[PDB]
Amino acid sequence: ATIGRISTGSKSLDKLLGGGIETQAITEVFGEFGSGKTQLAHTLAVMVQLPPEEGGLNGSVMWIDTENTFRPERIREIAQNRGLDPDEVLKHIAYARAFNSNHQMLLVQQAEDMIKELLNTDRPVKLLIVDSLTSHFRSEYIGRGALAERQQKLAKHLADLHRLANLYDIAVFVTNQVQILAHSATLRVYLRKGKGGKRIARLIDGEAVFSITEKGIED
Ligand SMILES: c1ccc2[nH]ncc2c1
Numbered sequence: 001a002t003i004g005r006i007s008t009g010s011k012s013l014d015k016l017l018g019g020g021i022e023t024q025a026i027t028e029v030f031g032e033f034g035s036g037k038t039q040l041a042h043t044l045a046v047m048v049q050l051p052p053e054e055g056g057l058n059g060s061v062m063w064i065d066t067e068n069t070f071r072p073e074r075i076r077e078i079a080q081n082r083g084l085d086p087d088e089v090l091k092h093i094a095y096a097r098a099f100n101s102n103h104q105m106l107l108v109q110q111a112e113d114m115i116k117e118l119l120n121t122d123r124p125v126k127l128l129i130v131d132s133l134t135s136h137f138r139s140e141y142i143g144r145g146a147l148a149e150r151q152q153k154l155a156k157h158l159a160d161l162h163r164l165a166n167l168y169d170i171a172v173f174v175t176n177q178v179q180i181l182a183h184s185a186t187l188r189v190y191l192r193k194g195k196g197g198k199r200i201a202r203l204i205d206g207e208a209v210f211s212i213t214e215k216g217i218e219d
Pocket residue numbers: 062063064094095096107108110111114
């Protein structure tokens with residue numbers, strides 16, 4: 001299958017990304033607390049539901065939340081302010097809270113069932129969010145010996161996510177709170193606060209600038 005692209009809501013960020021976030025890929029955003037990672041996730045969960053000529057994929061969403069940071073009313077606000085029905089947009093987000101890293105890993109395997117179910121509907125899953133990818137791993141795997149163990153478990157989790165992205169033509173979008181370790185996302189985006197309330201994004205391994213607004217994010 002040909003890759004699809006999802007607009008982030010920001011023309012600046014879309015250009016940095018080569019045209020939006022890609023299906024058949026894991027895009028990791030990383031940065032300090034407050035850098036806007038979860039706001040971008042909320043915005044993408046709306047944008048993907050737009051038709052293709054508007055920057056979406058007519059897609060549904062699966063969201064794995066490890067920090068209780070998903071806000072249904074933020075989805076509804078972004079949707080309404082972009083001209084979409086807030087309740088229809090929210091309904092197309094399947095939502096699960098991951099209680100620990102082992103549950104998080106099972107939830108990714110479990111997501112395949114709904115992905116298959118929806119694959120030939122008019123709104124197949126096109127975006128899978130894990131927010132936060134790393135928080136449970138960081139809390140659970142700590143101290144001498146934990147680097148190798150945590151990295152190996154994360155590698156398996158990321159392999160599972162890569163398979164879903166690649167097999168079912170889904171964009172996987174993950175967040176990581178930061179600030180030497182290896183990473184296996186296909187693309188890593190460093191996010192930080194800038195002047196005037198702006199957020200600045202840089203590809204890791206130019207910079208885009210955007211604001212967090214009632215439309216989610218925009219230039
Ligand atoms: C991941 C995210 C949301 C979900 N809803 N049901 C299963 C599942 C897995």
